[PDB]
Write a protein that holds these residues in place. Structure first.
Motif, PDB file in Angstrom:
ATOM      1  N   UNK A 127     -49.846  79.096  78.591  1.00 16.40           N
ATOM      2  CA  UNK A 127     -50.704  79.673  77.574  1.00 16.40           C
ATOM      3  C   UNK A 127     -52.164  79.715  77.977  1.00 16.40           C
ATOM      4  N   UNK A 140     -53.618  76.226  78.520  1.00 22.40           N
ATOM      5  CA  UNK A 140     -53.180  75.656  79.789  1.00 22.40           C
ATOM      6  C   UNK A 140     -53.914  76.290  80.962  1.00 22.40           C
ATOM      7  N   UNK A 141     -54.064  77.616  80.944  1.00 27.39           N
ATOM      8  CA  UNK A 141     -54.773  78.294  82.024  1.00 27.39           C
ATOM      9  C   UNK A 141     -56.228  77.853  82.087  1.00 27.39           C
ATOM     10  N   UNK A 163     -56.396  74.279  83.500  1.00 28.48           N
ATOM     11  CA  UNK A 163     -56.144  74.259  84.937  1.00 28.48           C
ATOM     12  C   UNK A 163     -57.340  74.792  85.710  1.00 28.48           C
ATOM     13  N   UNK A 199     -52.319  72.646  72.760  1.00 30.90           N
ATOM     14  CA  UNK A 199     -50.967  72.756  73.280  1.00 30.90           C
ATOM     15  C   UNK A 199     -50.633  71.714  74.330  1.00 30.90           C
ATOM     16  N   UNK A 200     -51.540  71.488  75.266  1.00 34.75           N
ATOM     17  CA  UNK A 200     -51.230  70.721  76.467  1.00 34.75           C
ATOM     18  C   UNK A 200     -51.575  69.256  76.260  1.00 34.75           C
ATOM     19  N   UNK A 215     -49.612  68.661  85.957  1.00 33.82           N
ATOM     20  CA  UNK A 215     -48.962  68.237  87.189  1.00 33.82           C
ATOM     21  C   UNK A 215     -49.595  68.962  88.364  1.00 33.82           C
ATOM     22  N   UNK A 260     -49.449  76.861  86.319  1.00 34.06           N
ATOM     23  CA  UNK A 260     -49.258  77.000  84.884  1.00 34.06           C
ATOM     24  C   UNK A 260     -47.791  77.239  84.547  1.00 34.06           C
ATOM     25  N   UNK A 261     -47.330  76.600  83.478  1.00 31.91           N
ATOM     26  CA  UNK A 261     -45.981  76.832  82.981  1.00 31.91           C
ATOM     27  C   UNK A 261     -45.953  78.135  82.190  1.00 31.91           C
ATOM     28  N   UNK A 285     -45.338  79.828  79.537  1.00 32.55           N
ATOM     29  CA  UNK A 285     -44.966  79.876  78.128  1.00 32.55           C
ATOM     30  C   UNK A 285     -46.053  80.619  77.368  1.00 32.55           C
ATOM     31  N   UNK A 286     -45.846  80.825  76.067  1.00 32.39           N
ATOM     32  CA  UNK A 286     -46.798  81.560  75.250  1.00 32.39           C
ATOM     33  C   UNK A 286     -47.500  80.711  74.202  1.00 32.39           C
ATOM     34  N   UNK A 287     -46.999  79.512  73.910  1.00 34.12           N
ATOM     35  CA  UNK A 287     -47.608  78.649  72.907  1.00 34.12           C
ATOM     36  C   UNK A 287     -47.955  77.255  73.407  1.00 34.12           C
ATOM     37  N   UNK A 288     -47.421  76.820  74.548  1.00 39.13           N
ATOM     38  CA  UNK A 288     -47.688  75.536  75.191  1.00 39.13           C
ATOM     39  C   UNK A 288     -47.139  74.354  74.407  1.00 39.13           C
ATOM     40  N   UNK A 289     -46.572  74.573  73.222  1.00 41.36           N
ATOM     41  CA  UNK A 289     -45.959  73.509  72.444  1.00 41.36           C
ATOM     42  C   UNK A 289     -44.443  73.581  72.421  1.00 41.36           C
ATOM     43  N   UNK A 334     -46.070  86.191  81.636  1.00 42.91           N
ATOM     44  CA  UNK A 334     -47.097  87.004  82.277  1.00 42.91           C
ATOM     45  C   UNK A 334     -46.535  88.057  83.221  1.00 42.91           C
ATOM     46  N   UNK A 342     -40.195  68.151  75.821  1.00 44.19           N
ATOM     47  CA  UNK A 342     -41.048  69.071  75.082  1.00 44.19           C
ATOM     48  C   UNK A 342     -41.542  70.231  75.931  1.00 44.19           C
ATOM     49  N   UNK A 343     -41.325  70.193  77.242  1.00 46.88           N
ATOM     50  CA  UNK A 343     -41.786  71.248  78.129  1.00 46.88           C
ATOM     51  C   UNK A 343     -40.667  72.027  78.799  1.00 46.88           C
TER      52      UNK A 343
END
Ligand SMILES: *[C@@H]1O[C@H](CO)[C@@H](O[C@@H]2O[C@H](CO)[C@@H](O)[C@H](O)[C@H]2NC(C)=O)[C@H](O)[C@H]1NC(C)=O
Ligand SMILES: CN1CCC[C@H]1c1cccnc1
Lengths: 400, 400, 400, 400, 400
Positions: free
Chosen positions: B1, B4-5, B8, B74-75, B79, C19-20, C22-26, C64, C154-155
């Protein structure tokens, strides 16, 4: 720390890891080289490869990596990874590993004045000549040749320091004697510039308790048991079996020793000479046994005892070995028959006397050959096992 | 999200993966070290190499890897892979692998406040001393020395945490006793700064059911079978074959033991002592059998039984063992003829009586030697087997 | 192509592989994990290691990596190599390899809607328990454990798809019963975060035709041949060599069999029990042969044969076995001589009769022990072989 | 150094490592290729590979890397690592290794006039034919082929320089005869452009001392011992055990020796021929021993001696071997009794005479076959061992 | 040079190595795939793998890598290393090495019109079924499967070209028959698109000379030698030792032979069943020898020979093989005494006359079983040897 970050940012300005860090370009960069022996892990006699565990020690002075601790109070040393600062390219010419260089590349510790330290560990597989002439009473000298690969003698002044053995862990099979080193410069057909190198020689002595208990003693006992054929009576009918079985049972010892030995053609191993001697002893033991057996099962009236055989085996050896040599018409018809029967018995008596004398000759021969073979085997074993040098030292250090 | 971006991007700004993440450069960095034993792969007795499967555990606080959860809802953790953040250079000192490092580099999980966790798995080949003095009823201690290669005591404060064994999988051949740890500081010839390290000791007890049932029982059975040479009547003429064949069949067992055992000279293995004792037992049995056979086939007229030998064997040991001792002119010409025949028969009777006496003496000697050898082999095997410490514990834990 | 070049340029804009996607990070990112078995390569019983050829299968959705097909005609899929995009960190847990991750990093295929596929191939060495209790009639279960090393619940939640065996290739030594799985779930003591993982159990059955034909039938035949010593007459003189030679053959057979078997002390294997029973039978046969030979060569005047042995052997077991038991003054001088000769002949006849009685007793004992030993060996072999729960299935499948 | 820093900065300006360093792009770049042999480490006859320690040597000219030493006084040579300079792609065509290129990448030394010098070391495993027809008296010719993988002759023309043997370390098993080079030009169907390559043929001669001591002599001695069955008298009862055990030992010898040689089927090796001849000789000796034993234990009245064998043996063969051929009313009733006894004794003695005839015939046959086999064994051994083309040279250079 | 430097700079302008070099993005890129076999390194029957030396030929057309040769005189080809240009992801599907892809990454040659040639070398360890049923007369068919891992018929359509064997080097053990290819498609359920794959099957014929000479001839000769047990006379006392020694030797022979073959339970190998048949032959010979020995030593005073035996073993079977059947008061007291002695002699003669019949019966059985066993062995050997297909072809091609 802010000081650490600032120092790391400043120390990498216009820094080229491809250049030799010297203030003046016309002088060699002095490098001190040494290694720390940690463990002798393997000595391959068949493949002629020595495996050790050492820590290379490289030290030199860098001119660009200097700073004043007044402006950077907290930080006193800086560590750099591979590929970021200049490092000597010191290799092992004697390598015997698929990758020609086995060193785990660690960081480089630097002074506040520019003294770089490099302590790369690694397990080194070098090829050294292994001499098995006096196995297993042999001392080996395996060399480790180190030196820069692409730096001549006008740019890299290699200097040797004494090896450190304060962390050495005993192998339990090889006893370490020492590890000296010497520096020399050679000329190579590539170029016209000397290339200095540092050579370390590892001297170790094999501990002989295990080999003595597992290879020498059983052969002694079995060879001694092989002489037991010269005590069995010929009437038992078992004399050939002992010699044949001991020969068979020592063939496997010969094959074992062959399988643990390198296929070298420079000299005859001492253990090989021992086993050949034992083979010869057993072979002539079997030959003598056959001779005695054919002397004992002699056919009466099948031949005449030669006068030489009679004298030598009945008047000389018998004395020397204290032998003891064992030792109306009806009535007429009845008489003819009884004299015939008695004459038959008399001929039987003469034949059995001849057989007894032949058997006595066989026994005398057997005992004489027993004594001769016992003396010969004792002398041969003692001479072969005492010929090897430092055998007294090996015995006094391992057994007693 | 997006959060997160943004996080990072923010964290890697002006970050040097070289500097030590400490707010104050003077103070050291505290790193907690721990180990997680999973399985024991192999215990190479011949090569003195122990193979394991463990998970290293490290923890430390990073000063720059901090953020506020409110601004990034969110985060909560991030890692980083290898080569992007600072990591301790902790590696195993006693490594027998061709490459000095066997860890598998994984990600580093980070708190919201700067706590880094690093759990790299791997298979480690560490060279540890293996003691075979009391094989197979032996317990081995192997050490695992971990420490920072290039960070001293003034930079890294390497604490120790108790080793964790919960996911441990039983080996089926080795019984785990425990795995304690100990931290100490040592000085090296390189530098005047102590280098702390953490040492983990693994204590394994060998399970002896397989080795017992495959080596000890067959050897005892064959040794007992070798005593049957004293029950075979001498007239069968097959006494020596039994002894020589069991000698071969135990020489092959000695070969197998030499194959499995290492070549150290530190001590004499218990199995080696047992096999040597059995070897002497069978050799003495063969020697006694040869003596008995040469007694049985005694040539009459070829010697006189000594009075001492008679008083020793015939009437003393037989008492001890309670064995019974076995056991017109024409008519003249015919008269001397039948007299000659009768005299020959009488001489034959005397000779066979002497031979019977010799055979009984041989039987008496055979019985004596049977009893003596049986008691001696029983005592020797019991003593050798019971001399080993914790032998009763091993028996009661494996067989029972 | 112009369109795919533009798309590749656009997609990597502002992309962070750390970055993972996802769209909401939760909300955790759902990943579907399955398997694809190709071949079973080796089952190392000694090292407890299984080697398999396996294709992995992964599938997640990337937010993305999406585009409109109408704006990029023709371009329907794109592919990225290692490191350019985000990949799950899924690896084998119970791996047995110097390098932990035994996968080949191929490209990731991405659809127009952001669907990623990943099929990394590799040869996986897994350390699994190998039961050997009923070898060779044994069925083994080996476990493969997968799961993310660092990502929690959760991830990254792991979902299972059914294993695919369409491409399986028959082994020729192991029969694949099947491969099921279980999608387990684990919780920690801190947080209500379910950590999921997928485990796969491979169940295989060993084909027993080769092991049977090469181990059991030869050993049964040789054991049966070892019973021929009882049918051999004592006067031949070869009643001991036969037994001792079959004993040597059995010892060699045990030595060669134990070279493929693990050294675990968990339980006594079936093949070991069978070999031990055969060894006991052969040793007892040798002992009985010694006793029979002792009876055969009994001294005629060495004692008196006990009445109990009489009334047993010559009375009960003989009828049971249906054996027939075999069975002027000078004239006076010549008279005395001929009376002496006749008395000697009569004594010889009586001694011969006693010897014949002893020989018949020995023959009766020999036949009785032959019958008993045949029954013993048949019963023991049948009972040992019938104890395997999979014996009927194995003989019905492989042999039939 | 300031000067070398500036020179390094200026040299890598607008430099492309992918570009061939020429000045016209239409002239081939001359490259000189040599080879420095260090030692021969292994010659695997089973796998038909050769392992050697070799230093490569490539030299060419670089047009761009040129500078004037006047502006850079101290600097005379520069060095570059892999990837920052153009290097020839020289490879080993007939390589046998997991990695097709087993070389270590070192620095490239460059002079002040653009002259490069690359000397990468390594351990090379190459597949070469191994001829075992004359084993162990072998001379092998293993070839090493080098050449650019992608560069043609119009762009890269290799030039051959004489191989350097200085610094060679003797193996101790293989004697090096020499290593001559040859440059060959191969054309294509494309166009009239050469494709030069450089090949080196390593010629080695096996040193026949270890094999001669461990295989040839022991087997010759055992074969000679196997002839002793003919000197053994037939009454001993050991005329077959000797032969059968010798045959068993020798077949074990042959089957173990077969583990060394490869499974090739292009010729029948010398050692195989010799072992087969020994097998045939021992088998025929056993057959003759069986025939002789059949002759010896002939029934006195089970047949008649054929005239043909009588005249051939007792008359002609005795001449050849010069063997001496051995060798009141009751009075009536008493008369028939004594006459019956006398005629019984006469029949016994005539049967004894017939048996003596048969025994003498057996002995004569035995002597004749002993002479024949003694001739045959020597003739076959000499003929087989003298067939090696370099047998005389091998003996004179390994023993004398 | 200047022109090639400019061209290299120009070609990499806005180049993306992640895209297919097509011009329409919808038309698949045609790729030609071929093969170039060089040598068959090794064929492993145990692990069922095939190792070969192979060159992979690839070719395609690149749209962007084009230039006008007039503007760049002298320059005709350019080379690009791994990673700088797009390359097909073609790899071995059925691999057996630890790294799934084993090809040395070399440069790619590009022509002036945009044609790419890629010839990576390597050593490939495949996994193919090895049929051992007709061992050692095998003919194998090992398959090699190649194809793109991710690209499909929409993107990359493979083509096929005949494999090249002009560079083949004969193995010496395996005779290469040929290597044909085939291009095949595989439609998916989703999408009606081709999925080209190219597969090559290598067919090799084993050379039987070495295996025959080392396994079959010695076994036949040893069986023939064991067949001599029936010609040996029973009085020697060696009829059992010979047979049992041959049995033990051939058992160890079979056990050693079994190590070079896999544990495949799909078929019974020819060599295995031949060894089995020889096993039953020798066992039955030993049983017959035991029966003959029992008959020879029959007790004269025991039971009576049944009439069935009296006819069949003495008249019928001897006619079948033509063995002739071998065949004053003191005076009264003296008379009675001599009558007693003569009666004893007559009874002894009558008793002895019965043992001759039993001995002749034993001889008859010996001859009959010799003939029967020789015929059985010849028939079985011929049948098993000639049962295998192409045995005539193998023998004609190898031994002649
Ligand atoms: C730099 O190194 C090369 C090494 O080859 C030198 O080339 C040689 O130089 C000597 C004397 O000048 C000549 O005798 C040789 O013939 C040259 N070898 C070749 C293949 O031409 C070169 O001269 C050196 N350049 C400088 C400035 O020192
Ligand atoms: C503790 N480390 C490991 C051995 C020496 C020491 C060290 C010191 C400086 C640089 N590298 C290593």
């Amino acid at each position: 720390g802010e000081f650490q970050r600032k120092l790391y940012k400043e120390l990498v300005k216009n820094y080229n890891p491809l250049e030799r860090p010297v203030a003046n370009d016309s002088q060699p960069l002095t490098v001190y080289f040494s290694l720390s022996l940690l463990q002798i892990m393997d000595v391959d006699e068949k493949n002629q490869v020595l495996t050790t565990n050492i820590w290379l020690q490289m030290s030199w002075t860098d001119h660009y990596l200097q700073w004043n601790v007044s402006e950077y109070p907290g930080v006193k040393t800086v560590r750099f990874p591979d590929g970021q600062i200049w490092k000597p390219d010191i290799l092992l010419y004697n390598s015997a590993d698929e990758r020609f260089d086995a060193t785990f590349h660690t960081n480089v510790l630097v002074n506040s004045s520019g003294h770089c330290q490099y302590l790369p560990p690694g397990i080194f597989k070098s090829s050294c000549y292994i001499d098995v002439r006096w196995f297993p009473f042999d001392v080996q000298h395996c060399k480790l040749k180190f030196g820069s690969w692409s730096y001549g003698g006008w740019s890299l002044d290699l200097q040797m320091q004494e090896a450190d053995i304060s962390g050495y862990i005993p192998n339990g099979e090889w006893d370490l004697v020492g590890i000296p080193g010497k520096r020399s410069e050679r000329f190579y057909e590539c170029c016209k510039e000397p290339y200095p190198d540092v050579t370390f020689t590892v001297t170790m002595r094999r501990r002989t308790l295990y080999y003595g208990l597992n290879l020498l003693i059983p052969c002694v006992l079995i060879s001694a048991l092989a002489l037991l054929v010269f005590l069995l009576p010929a009437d038992s009918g078992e004399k050939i079996s002992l010699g044949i079985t001991v020969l068979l049972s020592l063939t496997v010892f010969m094959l074992l020793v062959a399988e643990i030995m390198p296929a070298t053609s420079d000299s005859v191993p001492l253990i090989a000479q021992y086993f050949a001697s034992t083979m010869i002893i057993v072979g002539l033991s079997v030959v003598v046994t056959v001779i005695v057996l054919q002397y004992h099962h002699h056919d009466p009236d099948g031949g005449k005892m030669p006068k030489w055989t009679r004298v030598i085996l009945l008047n000389w050896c018998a004395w020397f070995l204290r032998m003891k040599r064992p030792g109306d018409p009806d009535l007429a018809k009845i008489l003819e028959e009884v004299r015939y029967i008695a004459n038959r018995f008399r001929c039987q008596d003469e034949s059995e006397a001849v057989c007894s004398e032949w058997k006595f000759a066989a026994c005398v021969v057997d005992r004489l050959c027993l004594m001769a073979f016992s003396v010969f085997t004792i002398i041969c074993t003692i001479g072969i096992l005492m010929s090897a040098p430092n055998f007294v030292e090996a015995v006094s250090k391992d057994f007693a």
